[PDB]
Design a protein around this nucleic acid. Structure first.
Ligand code: NA
Ligand code: NA
Length: 327
DNA sequence: CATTAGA
DNA sequence: TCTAATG
């Protein structure tokens, strides 16, 4: 957690590089396992060899360990950190809709700078274009202050459109976090569940709504179960407008809410833990359901839920407020 | 790990 | 169709 961090962090530095600049899934996958194990390791790594004993830690990595242990630096790292091309890819990648595949492709073409992108807004697709369009706004955090204003609006329409709607703004937001990245609206409705052959307009109705009013200003992607967009707070009697923000909505079968809701609310750890807990308590929990375990090895049978509570009960736990969903 | 674009 | 990009 700190006793072997540099090693791990250098490792991840390395790893990530292979994945992105180079197209070396393997090496990249190497660095990651290695970083994982060493990370586990209960002692201070003092040398390659000691490291090397490790599973996944070969001669390659060990080698880097020593050089780093010796000189608190690495060349390959130092070389890469320098490398314009590689620096370039790490950056373009920040543009929403820009992957590494694209990042290289763009570079090769010679698009390195943000402006480069602008000069050629044509070589970019709608997603990427909007990505670029709102680059600055997409990088800025979301004050809960705004979260509250945002949430409030979304809820208001949802209800206005159909009273039978169920929405939940999951995430950190939900976990009481002071700020957030983008807003996540978990959606469902009774006329939709596991079997009931859809009702795409169920999704569509709302979206239209939020656009209607002008909260949604753009669509990244819209499918029959997941809308990916950008929204905006109504720049008051201005002198102050609002940054453009990422927003996502997803329709859900009412018979799978709380689970998802459980799940999207997190935290990353709280889940796992809550997840490990169900296992002992004779269960299984995943993004959609909770199913009683059967000794034979595995087992099915999706237990009926009506609130985050049911799930809790099932594994016989303490209701944990979103607030304290921290781990 | 699944859901969307696009080509 | 596959393949990429987001979460
Ligand atoms: Na080994
Ligand atoms: Na990106």
């Amino acid at each position: 957690e700190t006793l072997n961090g540099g090693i791990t962090d250098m490792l991840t530095e390395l790893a990530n590089f292979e994945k992105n600049v180079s197209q070396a899934i393997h090496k990249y996958n190497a660095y990651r396992k290695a970083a994982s194990v060493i990370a586990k390791y209960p002692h201070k790594i003092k040398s390659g060899a000691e490291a090397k004993k490790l599973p996944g830690v070969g001669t390659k990595i060990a080698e880097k360990i020593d050089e780093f242990l010796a000189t608190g630096k690495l060349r390959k790292l130092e070389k890469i950190r320098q490398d314009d091309t590689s620096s370039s890819i790490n950056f373009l990648t920040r543009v929403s809709g820009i992957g590494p595949s694209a990042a290289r492709k763009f570079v090769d073409e010679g698009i390195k700078t943000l402006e480069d992108l602008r000069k050629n807004e044509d070589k970019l697709n709608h997603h990427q274009r909007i990505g670029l369009k709102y680059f600055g706004d997409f990088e800025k955090r979301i004050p809960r202050e705004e979260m509250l204003q945002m949430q409030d609006i979304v809820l208001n329409e949802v209800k206005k459109v159909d009273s039978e709607y169920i929405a939940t703004v999951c995430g950190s937001f939900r976990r009481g976090a002071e700020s957030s990245g983008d807003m996540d609206v978990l959606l469902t409705h009774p006329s939709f569940t596991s079997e009931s052959t859809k009702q795409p307009k169920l999704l569509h109705q709302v979206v239209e709504q939020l656009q209607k009013v002008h909260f949604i200003t753009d669509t990244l992607s819209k499918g029959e179960t997941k809308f990916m967009g950008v929204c905006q707070l109504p720049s008051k009697n201005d002198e102050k407008e609002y940054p453009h923000r990422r927003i996502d909505i997803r329709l859900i079968p009412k018979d799978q809410y709380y689970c998802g809701v459980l799940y999207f609310t997190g935290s990353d750890i709280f889940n796992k833990n809550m997840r490990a807990h169900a296992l002992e308590k004779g269960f299984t929990i995943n993004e959609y359901t909770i199913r009683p375990l059967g000794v034979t090895g595995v087992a099915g049978e999706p237990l009926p839920v009506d609130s985050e509570k049911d799930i809790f009960d099932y594994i016989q736990w303490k209701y944990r407020e979103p607030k304290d969903r921290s781990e």
